[PDB]
């Protein structure tokens, strides 16, 4: 229940202090992108404070939660 998991076993461990979220999966850009993947910087938070219209991913309920791996109806 931390920053970057990835599905399985070694991960879900130690990155930032205790609680929810930690490094939020917050989408976006701020001033500049011109980039491809496309989606997400990172922080140390446990809250979700800004975030309404255009707009961002959230507070994690879970290990990763996550953007944008994201494929097709398959």
Swiss-Prot record:
Native organism: Bungarus multicinctus
Recorded GO CC terms: extracellular region
Disulfide bonds: 3-23, 16-44, 29-33, 48-59, 60-65
GO molecular function list: acetylcholine receptor inhibitor activity; ion channel regulator activity; toxin activity
Further remarks about this protein from its record: Is identical to Alpha-bungarotoxin (A31) from B.candidus (AC Q7T3J2).
Function, in words: Binds with high affinity to muscular (tested on Torpedo marmorata, Kd=0.4 nM) and neuronal (tested on chimeric alpha-7/CHRNA7, Kd=0.95 nM) nicotinic acetylcholine receptor (nAChR) and inhibits acetylcholine from binding to the receptor, thereby impairing neuromuscular and neuronal transmission. It also shows an activity on GABA(A) receptors. It antagonises GABA-activated currents with high potency when tested on primary hippocampal neurons.
Segment of the intact protein contained: 22 to 95 of 95
Main location: secreted
Superkingdom, taxonomy of origin: Eukaryota
High-level lineage: Eukaryota, Metazoa, Chordata, Craniata, Vertebrata
Expression (tissue specificity): Expressed by the venom gland.
Protein name: Alpha-bungarotoxin
Family note: Belongs to the three-finger toxin family. Long-chain subfamily. Type II alpha-neurotoxin sub-subfamily.
Locations listed in the record: Secreted
Subunit structure: Monomer in solution, homodimer in crystal state.
Keywords assigned: Acetylcholine receptor inhibiting toxin, Disulfide bond, Ion channel impairing toxin, Neurotoxin, Postsynaptic neurotoxin, Secreted, Signal, Toxin
């Amino acid at each position: 229940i931390v920053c970057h998991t990835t599905a399985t076993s070694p991960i879900s461990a130690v990155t930032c202090p205790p609680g929810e979220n930690l490094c939020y999966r917050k989408m976006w850009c701020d001033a500049f992108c011109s980039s491809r993947g496309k989606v997400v910087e990172l922080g140390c938070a446990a809250t979700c404070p800004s975030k309404k219209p255009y707009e961002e991913v959230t507070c994690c309920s879970t290990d990763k939660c996550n953007p944008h791996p994201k494929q097709r109806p398959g």
